[PDB]
Design a protein around this ligand. Sequence first.
Ligand SMILES: [Ca+2]
Ligand SMILES: [Ca+2]
Ligand SMILES: [Ca+2]
Ligand SMILES: [Zn+2]
Ligand SMILES: [Zn+2]
Length: 169
Amino acid sequence: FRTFPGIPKWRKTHLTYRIVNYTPDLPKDAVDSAVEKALKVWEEVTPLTFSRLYEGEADIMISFAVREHGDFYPFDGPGNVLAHAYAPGPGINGDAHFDDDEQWTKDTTGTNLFLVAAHEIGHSLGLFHSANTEALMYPLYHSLTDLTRFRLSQDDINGIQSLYGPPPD
Ligand SMILES: [Ca+2]
Ligand SMILES: [Ca+2]
Ligand SMILES: [Ca+2]
Ligand SMILES: [Zn+2]
Ligand SMILES: [Zn+2]
């Protein structure tokens, strides 16, 4: 696993998220479930906990965007860059933007929202890319049809626990 230069990390264990907008690709509850499960992945192996906000500035603001969207990194149309997320910190840091030029799906027929979201939240929490091929934090989106088997790899658990430690009890 790779942590980020300077090892920026959250100095608190309780983090808020806000789903700022919704893609036309899916039912709103599918977007909610995907994001909720993505957080869970990481919540499960650390003392981090998450709560959702519906107004104000949450630590992790989540949105869908197309091309230019308010930061210096425009999205790029279909495929390639699927999303991006900023390392821990204030304001735009911690935030995650998903390219709506992708077709987000609950399954693997398009771009799986839960999988990319689990990866991006890894970034929002302090993990950079891993050199390990079976890690979620590996840069490589394969269209893993088999989400039925998903498990955070040990390398991901090692990286995230190196930042925040294991679960307390
Ligand atoms: Ca933020
Ligand atoms: Ca793209
Ligand atoms: Ca879309
Ligand atoms: Zn962005
Ligand atoms: Zn990444």
